[PDB]
Amino acid sequence: GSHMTYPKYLLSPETIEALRKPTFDVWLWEPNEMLSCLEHMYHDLGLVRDFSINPVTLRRWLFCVHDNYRNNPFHNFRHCFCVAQMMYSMVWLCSLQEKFSQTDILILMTAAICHDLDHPGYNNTYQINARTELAVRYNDISPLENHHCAVAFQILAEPECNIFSNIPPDGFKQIRQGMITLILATDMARHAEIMDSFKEKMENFDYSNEEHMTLLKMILIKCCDISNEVRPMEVAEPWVDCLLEEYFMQSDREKSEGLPVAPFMDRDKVTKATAQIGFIKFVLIPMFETVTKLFPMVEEIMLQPLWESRDRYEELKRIDDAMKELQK
Ligand SMILES: C[C@H](c1nc2c(cnn2C2CCCC2)c(=O)[nH]1)N1CC(c2ncccn2)C1
Ligand SMILES: [Mg+2]
Numbered sequence: 001g002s003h004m005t006y007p008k009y010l011l012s013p014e015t016i017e018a019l020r021k022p023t024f025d026v027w028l029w030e031p032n033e034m035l036s037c038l039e040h041m042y043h044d045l046g047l048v049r050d051f052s053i054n055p056v057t058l059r060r061w062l063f064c065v066h067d068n069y070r071n072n073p074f075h076n077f078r079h080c081f082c083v084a085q086m087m088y089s090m091v092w093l094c095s096l097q098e099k100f101s102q103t104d105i106l107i108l109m110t111a112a113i114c115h116d117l118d119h120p121g122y123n124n125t126y127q128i129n130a131r132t133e134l135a136v137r138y139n140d141i142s143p144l145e146n147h148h149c150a151v152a153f154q155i156l157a158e159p160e161c162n163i164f165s166n167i168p169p170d171g172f173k174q175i176r177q178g179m180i181t182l183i184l185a186t187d188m189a190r191h192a193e194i195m196d197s198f199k200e201k202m203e204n205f206d207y208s209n210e211e212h213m214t215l216l217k218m219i220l221i222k223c224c225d226i227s228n229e230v231r232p233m234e235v236a237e238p239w240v241d242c243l244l245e246e247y248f249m250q251s252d253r254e255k256s257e258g259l260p261v262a263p264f265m266d267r268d269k270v271t272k273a274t275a276q277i278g279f280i281k282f283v284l285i286p287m288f289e290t291v292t293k294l295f296p297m298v299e300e301i302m303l304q305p306l307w308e309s310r311d312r313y314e315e316l317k318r319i320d321d322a323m324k325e326l327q328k
């Protein structure tokens with residue numbers, strides 16, 4: 001509709017609009033444009049307003065978070081943009097602003113954005129088995145996540161990046177604590193435990209009970225973190241090739257170094273379709289199914305796509321198997 005042309009990092013009104021939905025094409029955007037989006041989220045959600053974030057600091061902070069992600073095939077800045085943007089979608093799709101405080105929203109967002117800071121592209125199993133410095137340092141306890149978290153607060157400690165610089169120390173402490181819980185919650189080692197906790201509370205969920213809410217926030221950050229297959233098929237599908245890229249880098253290394261190899265990461269045994277059929281069926285669907293009990297609109301917007309994806313990979317699998325049978 002626009003009478004002249006703008007720079008990319010001036011998001012158009014349509015981009016700003018699209019950004020509220022999970023249909024958003026995360027791939028269309030370069031890092032600056034992504035950084036502008038994350039910026040707008042913080043303003044749009046009323047977090048700049050309500051926590052007096054100096055708006056140039058918001059930017060420096062974002063820029064600096066971005067510098068601290070690595071160029072991993074999957075665990076990179078675009079990943080965090082996805083996780084952050086899915087949280088944003090969900091604040092709208094589940095009207096989280098009715099249920100949550102702005103302090104909770106600020107934690108969900110800053111945790112989302114930071115939750116994979118300085119990821120090395122090899123998981124906790126590698127760290128632990130290779131007895132890496134991180135694994136030694138964190139006593140084999142959620143080493144990566146504890147690391148992301150530390151880098152998170154090291155950035156915020158720099159005064160030019162400190163988006164919380166104008167929050168009272170009580171609020172800071174409250175934000176810090178949420179952020180830590182949430183970022184450690186993203187360790188998939190704890191998935192069944194966290195899911196069981198949540199389901200127990202879900203027997204009689206209570207929005208005024210802090211414990212209930214911490215479990216809900218943990219499920220929300222977990223949803224956004226592994227949510228790629230909720231996105232449109234053209235947007236989701238390239239991620240899987242990236243994740244397999246990293247997964248294979250590790251299992252090569254693991255073979256060469258004489259360490260155990262996850263069959264789910266073993267080049268020789270994972271294929272895409274088999275990888276995702278199981279993840280969608282037994283991790284993603286069930287998780288969003290229980291979310292839907294609190295937020296029924298989540299079914300239409302996020303279970304449906306997951307069903308379609310499950311069903312397509314089932315189709316693709318039927319065809320791989322035929323063909324891999326002609327390799328023999
Ligand atoms: C490829 C598939 C996968 N993992 C994903 C996706 C998104 N996040 N993640 C993970 C979560 C933690 C970091 C990456 C995704 O879409 N697919 N992995 C295979 C693994 C598996 N383990 C055991 C059995 C079967 N399958 C699930
Ligand atoms: Mg992680």
Ligand SMILES: [Zn+2]
Nearest residue numbers: 079115116225
């Ligand atoms: Zn992640």
